[PDB]
Write an enzyme that holds these catalytic residues in place. Sequence first.
Site, mmCIF file in Angstrom:
data_model
loop_
_atom_site.group_PDB
_atom_site.id
_atom_site.type_symbol
_atom_site.label_atom_id
_atom_site.label_comp_id
_atom_site.label_asym_id
_atom_site.label_seq_id
_atom_site.Cartn_x
_atom_site.Cartn_y
_atom_site.Cartn_z
ATOM 1 N N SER A 96 -1.717 6.063 4.071
ATOM 2 C CA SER A 96 -0.344 6.411 3.628
ATOM 3 C C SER A 96 0.185 7.562 4.470
ATOM 4 O O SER A 96 0.206 7.401 5.684
ATOM 5 C CB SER A 96 -0.328 6.695 2.121
ATOM 6 O OG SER A 96 0.993 6.801 1.624
ATOM 7 N N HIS A 101 -0.315 -1.299 -1.589
ATOM 8 C CA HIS A 101 -0.624 0.013 -1.055
ATOM 9 C C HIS A 101 -2.032 0.517 -1.347
ATOM 10 O O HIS A 101 -2.560 1.305 -0.572
ATOM 11 C CB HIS A 101 0.406 1.053 -1.509
ATOM 12 C CG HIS A 101 0.419 2.251 -0.628
ATOM 13 N ND1 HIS A 101 0.687 2.149 0.712
ATOM 14 C CD2 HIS A 101 0.165 3.541 -0.927
ATOM 15 C CE1 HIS A 101 0.579 3.370 1.185
ATOM 16 N NE2 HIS A 101 0.282 4.237 0.229
HETATM 17 C C1 LIG Z 1 3.960 7.715 2.376
HETATM 18 C C2 LIG Z 1 3.500 8.798 1.483
HETATM 19 C C3 LIG Z 1 3.048 9.695 0.830
HETATM 20 C C4 LIG Z 1 2.557 10.902 0.130
HETATM 21 N N1 LIG Z 1 1.723 10.603 -1.038
HETATM 22 C C5 LIG Z 1 2.052 10.997 -2.338
HETATM 23 N N2 LIG Z 1 3.361 11.107 -2.761
HETATM 24 C C6 LIG Z 1 3.557 11.727 -4.105
HETATM 25 C C7 LIG Z 1 3.370 10.629 -5.167
HETATM 26 C C8 LIG Z 1 4.317 9.394 -4.874
HETATM 27 C C9 LIG Z 1 4.134 8.869 -3.446
HETATM 28 N N3 LIG Z 1 5.077 7.778 -3.135
HETATM 29 C C10 LIG Z 1 4.338 10.015 -2.416
HETATM 30 N N4 LIG Z 1 0.940 11.221 -3.060
HETATM 31 C C11 LIG Z 1 -0.076 11.005 -2.217
HETATM 32 C C12 LIG Z 1 0.352 10.585 -0.955
HETATM 33 C C13 LIG Z 1 -0.541 10.225 0.143
HETATM 34 O O1 LIG Z 1 -0.203 9.840 1.227
HETATM 35 N N5 LIG Z 1 -1.955 10.395 -0.189
HETATM 36 C C14 LIG Z 1 -2.952 10.050 0.854
HETATM 37 C C15 LIG Z 1 -3.745 8.840 0.381
HETATM 38 C C16 LIG Z 1 -3.107 7.703 -0.221
HETATM 39 C C17 LIG Z 1 -3.880 6.606 -0.672
HETATM 40 C C18 LIG Z 1 -5.252 6.661 -0.486
HETATM 41 C C19 LIG Z 1 -6.087 5.583 -0.897
HETATM 42 N N6 LIG Z 1 -6.761 4.717 -1.226
HETATM 43 C C20 LIG Z 1 -5.922 7.755 0.115
HETATM 44 C C21 LIG Z 1 -5.162 8.876 0.568
HETATM 45 C C22 LIG Z 1 -2.390 10.875 -1.454
HETATM 46 N N7 LIG Z 1 -3.672 11.066 -1.853
HETATM 47 C C23 LIG Z 1 -3.713 11.605 -3.271
HETATM 48 C C24 LIG Z 1 -2.186 11.649 -3.680
HETATM 49 N N8 LIG Z 1 -1.483 11.194 -2.464
#
Ligand SMILES: CC#CCn1c(N2CCC[C@@H](N)C2)nc2c1c(=O)n(Cc1ccc(C#N)cc1)c1nccn21
Lengths: 728, 728
Positions: free
Chosen positions: A592, A702
Amino acid sequence: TRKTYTLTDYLKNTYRLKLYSLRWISDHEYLYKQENNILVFNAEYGNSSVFLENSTFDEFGHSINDYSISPDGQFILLEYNYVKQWRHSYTASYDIYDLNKRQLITEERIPNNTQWVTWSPVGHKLAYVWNNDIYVKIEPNLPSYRITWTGKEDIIYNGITDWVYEEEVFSAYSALWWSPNGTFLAYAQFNDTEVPLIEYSFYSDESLQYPKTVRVPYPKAGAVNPTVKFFVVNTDSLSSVTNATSIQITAPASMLIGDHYLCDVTWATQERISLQWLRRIQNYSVMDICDYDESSGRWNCLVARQHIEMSTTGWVGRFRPSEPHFTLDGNSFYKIISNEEGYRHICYFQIDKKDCTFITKGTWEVIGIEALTSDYLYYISNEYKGMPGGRNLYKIQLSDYTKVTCLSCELNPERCQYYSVSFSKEAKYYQLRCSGPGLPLYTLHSSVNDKGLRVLEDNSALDKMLQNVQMPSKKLDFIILNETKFWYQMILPPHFDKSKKYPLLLDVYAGPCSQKADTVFRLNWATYLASTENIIVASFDGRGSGYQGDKIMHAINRRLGTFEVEDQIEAARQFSKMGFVDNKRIAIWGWSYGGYVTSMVLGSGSGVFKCGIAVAPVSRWEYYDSVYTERYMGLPTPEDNLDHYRNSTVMSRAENFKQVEYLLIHGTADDNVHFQQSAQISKALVDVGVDFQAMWYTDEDHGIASSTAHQHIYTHMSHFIKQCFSLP
Amino acid sequence: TRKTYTLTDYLKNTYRLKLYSLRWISDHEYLYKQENNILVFNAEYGNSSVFLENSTFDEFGHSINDYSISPDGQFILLEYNYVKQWRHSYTASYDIYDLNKRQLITEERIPNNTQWVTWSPVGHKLAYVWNNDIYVKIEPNLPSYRITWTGKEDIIYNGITDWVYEEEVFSAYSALWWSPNGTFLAYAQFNDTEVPLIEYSFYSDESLQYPKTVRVPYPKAGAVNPTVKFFVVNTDSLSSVTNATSIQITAPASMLIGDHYLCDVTWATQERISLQWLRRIQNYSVMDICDYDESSGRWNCLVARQHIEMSTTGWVGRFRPSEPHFTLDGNSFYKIISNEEGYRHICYFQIDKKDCTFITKGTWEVIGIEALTSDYLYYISNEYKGMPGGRNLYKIQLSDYTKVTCLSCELNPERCQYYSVSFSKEAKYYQLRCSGPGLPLYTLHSSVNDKGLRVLEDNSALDKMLQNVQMPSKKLDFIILNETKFWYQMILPPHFDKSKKYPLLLDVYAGPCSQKADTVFRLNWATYLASTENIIVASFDGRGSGYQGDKIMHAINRRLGTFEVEDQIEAARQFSKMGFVDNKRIAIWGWSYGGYVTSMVLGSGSGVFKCGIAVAPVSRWEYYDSVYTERYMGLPTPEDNLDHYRNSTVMSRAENFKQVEYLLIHGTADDNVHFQQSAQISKALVDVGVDFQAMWYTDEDHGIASSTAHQHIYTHMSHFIKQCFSLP
Ligand SMILES: CC#CCn1c(N2CCC[C@@H](N)C2)nc2c1c(=O)n(Cc1ccc(C#N)cc1)c1nccn21
Ligand SMILES: CC#CCn1c(N2CCC[C@@H](N)C2)nc2c1c(=O)n(Cc1ccc(C#N)cc1)c1nccn21
Ligand SMILES: *[C@@H]1O[C@H](CO)[C@@H](O[C@@H]2O[C@H](CO)[C@@H](O)[C@H](O)[C@H]2NC(C)=O)[C@H](O)[C@H]1NC(C)=O
Ligand SMILES: *[C@@H]1O[C@H](CO)[C@@H](O[C@@H]2O[C@H](CO)[C@@H](O)[C@H](O)[C@H]2NC(C)=O)[C@H](O)[C@H]1NC(C)=O
Ligand SMILES: *[C@@H]1O[C@H](CO)[C@@H](O[C@@H]2O[C@H](CO)[C@@H](O)[C@H](O)[C@H]2NC(C)=O)[C@H](O)[C@H]1NC(C)=O
Ligand SMILES: *[C@@H]1O[C@H](CO)[C@@H](O[C@@H]2O[C@H](CO)[C@@H](O)[C@H](O)[C@H]2NC(C)=O)[C@H](O)[C@H]1NC(C)=O
Ligand SMILES: *[C@@H]1O[C@H](CO)[C@@H](O[C@@H]2O[C@H](CO)[C@@H](O)[C@H](O)[C@H]2NC(C)=O)[C@H](O)[C@H]1NC(C)=O
Ligand SMILES: *[C@@H]1O[C@H](CO)[C@@H](O[C@@H]2O[C@H](CO)[C@@H](O)[C@H](O)[C@H]2NC(C)=O)[C@H](O)[C@H]1NC(C)=O
Ligand SMILES: *[C@@H]1O[C@H](CO)[C@@H](O[C@@H]2O[C@H](CO)[C@@H](O)[C@H](O)[C@H]2NC(C)=O)[C@H](O)[C@H]1NC(C)=O
Ligand SMILES: *[C@@H]1O[C@H](CO)[C@@H](O[C@@H]2O[C@H](CO)[C@@H](O)[C@H](O)[C@H]2NC(C)=O)[C@H](O)[C@H]1NC(C)=O
Ligand SMILES: *[C@@H]1O[C@H](CO)[C@@H](O[C@@H]2O[C@H](CO)[C@@H](O)[C@H](O)[C@H]2NC(C)=O)[C@H](O)[C@H]1NC(C)=O
Ligand SMILES: *[C@@H]1O[C@H](CO)[C@@H](O)[C@H](O)[C@H]1NC(C)=O
Ligand SMILES: *[C@@H]1O[C@H](CO)[C@@H](O)[C@H](O)[C@H]1NC(C)=O
Ligand SMILES: *[C@@H]1O[C@H](CO)[C@@H](O)[C@H](O)[C@H]1NC(C)=O
Ligand code: NA
């Protein structure tokens, strides 16, 4: 020789963390599931009784996904036919079971394909959303009262959020809020008429001859946003009037001047509601405090009770303005706000006075307000030992702010530095949940004397199992860059020898308010990489990271894809300087926002990284949603921040990918970070003649979280990292 | 030491085959484009004159895609703003230049976005299709007469084919047929009202914020097909005051009873047209012969002039019933049909007699009828030396069928064994085009005494360049399976040594009527693999392959993914036992039908193949189009052939991929073999926990033919094959 923590250990979940998930039903009792039996525990003594035997629904005819007992304990809501939608949303069928009569209710059933259902906070009224309209049932076996008639698929959402409000504003599908004793039902209405649709193919089971086109109203940065209205209905009037009026509460003039959002709804009393509104340029928010006027039947929001929250350096709140916590009389409230030094602290407000009083201060931040009694406010902070990645519960005396007790700091200081808490209904008891650095530990406490009642779950079974495994260790520390401490963590191979040179994988998130350097104990892919593959898995919290003040967090304001990317490159150079890293074997990966940062790093031309893996990355800010993107980037217009939106794409760095080995992965049914994002990266790489590795995941979203896809992705990535690092 | 033929040589077209593309304009002259100038040549002497100077359109202001000189040589149609659609379809803008008055026509221009345009066969009338309607221009400067008014995007197609008719029936976008002297204009009308749409995402340039959904009426196997109507309009009786009357020619009763297709339109005389109709169950076809009735203005198709063509062993024709070749009076015709032994030979028919007489016979086949005079019929066949993979020109004396002369066999037997031909207007001259086994050779001949007039192009410049390159050789031989000979070819590395063991790549098509073992000279990916990498690239024609009679071709009738898959495994098994093949390094690859076969082979559990690559494969016949699929498979219904449609999928063999390395590649904008086909393969492999390699090509179609994607795909596949074969 002891075995290591293998990839199959991770994928098959051989070593399981035990949890202790309780549900408070009163100020002194909780529900807990033991061998599929729902037990009721007395918090004071620890004794239990079978609340509902596991055999009760053997002849139900459907696998029950979840349950919800009515607050008065008279009924149980049974959830089945669960069909997931987005991160929080889903549809389900519901049956109500009368606990007194020990009988299932067969008349006036909640309809199939119900979108959301909630009990009133007292008694047993129900509010539900079906076909985008709100319904209320005063009694489980009685006919529903329809509240709205405007609901329209993909267009009008009553009492439920649209895609962007669910994902980015409320972190919930629900857009309904019962008043404390259940007299009023407040709700939001979203209008997506002019919101453009994201469209993508969904292949389904192989039996489906033609793929389906999924179409979702999704505003990408700068596009037309949904509009919102807020209403309050008196549910006590339903059985007396043919069509009870939904009284609208309009946004203030300061919001009505342009695009805005409804960002918080908090009931203060039985007749007082607070609402927070946020401008589309997310550095200005307004709280209205609205009272029921019994004579007119209207809700009035006195301008003397209006509270402004603004930022000159960034946006408002960590991800949105914080929620207020009202004192019992509703005449004052506590709220986490950024102080003059840029540190988030608890401010105390009188409802009709504009200047608030800070009750906490220091170069550390309050994470959340957990409970409020007439004598004490309970909160979580990272104050302890000045460690931003640690979490502890504190109690502050409301009659004397100098009296602050840390309730968890010293319980087990070696094993436990990251806590969360669950208070009973009137905060008489609290469950502490320690999640690291040692094994998770769940304990019960009495608030009257802050005494430890008993250990609920200590993970002793897992500790015994892990003694026979060569486990990695975790180092949490900091480096000093430009007189500022920046925290990092490393998952270190067993028998870590600082005289040896190890390959290093940088595990990145690095989004605004991210925190990847913490005290949490995890059993994940990194555990395997360090334990079996002897790879150091490092993470760094640079500029833009959270819980360390606004000077750090707001450093990337209007400039995503800059300092947070540069700081990851710098972290890897700093890790090389430590002497135990093989500089020819440095890799980077992320999902992400982590995937966007990974890709930006791989396209930087730094020469630091040999390879990297981007999973479901953002590649261009104009492809991501309005609420999240614009919060940090503003609008993609020439008058605002278009030049930076255009300068911060992965695609513009394509030529630099000739210097690295890249693996690009994305689920085709990703409704969040669209497959489009990686489809544009791949096309730009092909256009410059860059060879790379790719993997699409059919119908995965996602999370790429189906059991088979989860195992497949981690296996595919493990082969890639191993090949990059010349590991057999 | 001399260079090898490298991957860059193939990708950058370093070694170019010279062509000699001419266009006959009479019985004595042809046009030839030389140095952007158009020359007219006299065939008897070889002298030329400039017909059109390259400088004529220096001030045109548009890049000219193509030109089309009117039959009388008075006008030139200038094609520009070319926008490709499917395999044959495109839109373009057109301008007409008057060659006599040396000026561009500015009055009554052909509109932009024109779908198809054609001069009448004689003179300079024009017929064009725009917005799915037909228009006729009698004179280039004069207003068009609108022929049809029903044209509707994706619904009604007048004078142009829909997707399935373009791809699978006519191999053309045009559905217009002028009578020989241009009096009449015959046309087909397609109705796709109830044909389902294939939908897929199109990403476009990075600037496009939301991906587009492309929607194409495409009938998958067993789905609702387009319906067809046939009409004839008199272009000599058009009015500026009245709408044109189109006379409908209805299909015979044997076709109207159910689903059917129009499969051939061939004018016999100025007032006689032949039409072939095919049942949706493609083993029954009917030719109608229709005469214009001057008194009634009607077209009458006498039942006594109907000709039935049917098959008890398979479908009719190689890909469709063959075209008739009418005599000058139109009272009789010659047509290739399968004889009683299952070999395709020329049959001579009388328009009003049921029995035809075979004029050729033998265990070999006629490929095509090329020219017809009152004394001779000229055809191409693979009779020579019983080589099914060779092609030669023959003439048969029409007054004595025992008098067959080969015209190309002995010209240069070592260099030339594969010919095509182009005859002048009344067959006074013919151009022979030799395409292998040596370098292509273009010669010009006169028919009266079969004199070899001159060498037009001998590729001696390329021969000189190739002298300095270590080129591979080609071996064409056969193996015997169940008393039947089956041919194969091997592209052998330079300095081939039978005492050495080489890795082997099986290059497969293996679809019905395919032929991959032939005498054609090619410069392709296989040339590089053999020359630079020392890989043997083998191809085999097993059951289902063409040009060897129906016993072989119809062997896979109603059974795709059976014998043709088994036969490739059997050929590789036989090759693996040869002394010069390394049995530890055998790979397989194919595109489209070859991708399906490669995938079915890789999932067979044979253990013969180490690895393989599938490019845009079919994975399940229910996903492919009705016309091609049902020709071999019948309908996917329980009463017809559903069980075989269900057991011939790649997805059902997924567990068998555990023991192979597989690379799956597909363009996301493939309108032909939908991306869905590979999306279902990857999901089945993920579901069984099989690791594999993948590559999607954003916005590429079935050809993956953009300059950058073509270079990227072959680069990616080369790395994969080299890794598989342990090659540096
Ligand atoms: C594009 C984008 C983005 C940012 N995003 C958001 N925010 C706030 C909440 C709503 C969301 N739309 C945006 N929360 C998170 C991300 C993000 O990238 N990761 C990194 C990550 C994501 C998924 C995995 C897996 N599997 C591992 C790391 C992550 N890890 C723990 C929480 N978050
Ligand atoms: C799915 C399917 C299929 C069969 N198909 C058809 N027919 C008859 C004409 C219309 C068409 N829809 C069906 N023609 C061909 C194929 C086919 O697979 N290949 C193998 C092949 C294809 C593309 C490339 C490339 N690049 C290489 C080999 C091929 N090579 C030369 C001609 N053809
Ligand atoms: C936990 O233990 C207490 C005390 O033993 C139970 O409380 C009640 O105690 C009364 C004494 O008057 C007994 O007659 C009952 O058996 C109890 N009441 C009820 C309503 O059950 C208590 O119930 C126990 N709690 C659980 C959850 O088992
Ligand atoms: C949702 O918003 C849309 C506009 O975005 C409103 O649709 C308009 O409604 C008025 C009637 O009051 C019409 O005259 C306009 O033609 C409509 N515009 C469009 C673009 O459709 C709609 O009424 C709103 N719906 C609700 C329930 O608030
Ligand atoms: C209950 O009251 C609402 C609000 O007046 C009615 O909603 C109106 O419905 C009619 C359609 O029949 C329209 O004239 C209005 O645009 C609606 N307004 C809103 C705010 O939704 C509703 O139909 C009533 N229900 C019944 C059963 O009478
Ligand atoms: C919960 O709160 C509501 C709102 O205060 C109470 O309803 C009011 O009750 C008083 C009676 O003491 C009346 O003067 C008002 O007319 C009521 N207002 C409305 C808007 O209904 C309600 O009684 C409380 N409910 C319970 C169950 O205690
Ligand atoms: C090829 O050569 C012949 C002569 O051998 C040319 O034939 C002549 O045609 C032109 C007019 O088009 C006259 O100048 C002569 O009177 C013709 N001579 C004969 C013998 O017919 C012919 O033009 C040349 N063809 C081309 C295409 O250049
Ligand atoms: C084909 O397209 C061109 C471009 O749209 C048309 O050419 C004229 O060109 C200018 C700008 O390039 C426009 O302002 C005019 O509207 C155009 N019209 C005329 C009448 O010259 C052109 O007309 C189109 N051709 C046909 C046959 O419709
Ligand atoms: C094209 O074909 C359609 C049938 O697919 C013809 O449409 C009508 O079809 C509907 C069902 O889709 C029937 O209810 C009607 O009776 C049909 N006829 C009419 C006159 O409405 C359609 O007319 C055809 N169009 C052309 C131009 O031939
Ligand atoms: C092409 O063929 C048509 C049809 O044979 C010719 O049209 C006929 O011409 C004669 C005049 O000599 C008339 O008797 C008929 O009534 C015409 N038939 C129709 C159907 O129009 C036509 O002359 C030929 N055209 C050319 C240019 O040779
Ligand atoms: C065309 O092929 C079909 C399918 O093979 C033949 O079908 C016959 O009729 C039905 C199909 O509904 C089957 O029950 C029979 O088994 C078929 N007859 C056989 C195999 O002899 C049909 O006969 C074919 N047409 C020709 C002219 O051979
Ligand atoms: C839900 O669906 C089932 C299956 O179609 C049906 O029998 C039942 O009556 C439905 N329940 C309600 C509450 O409509
Ligand atoms: C909100 O943001 C815009 C863009 O940075 C800015 O011009 C405006 O002054 C900001 N508001 C505050 C309170 O700083
Ligand atoms: C010709 O047909 C069209 C479409 O049906 C019609 O709109 C137009 O009026 C007609 N013109 C004449 C001259 O009949
Ligand atoms: Na000669």
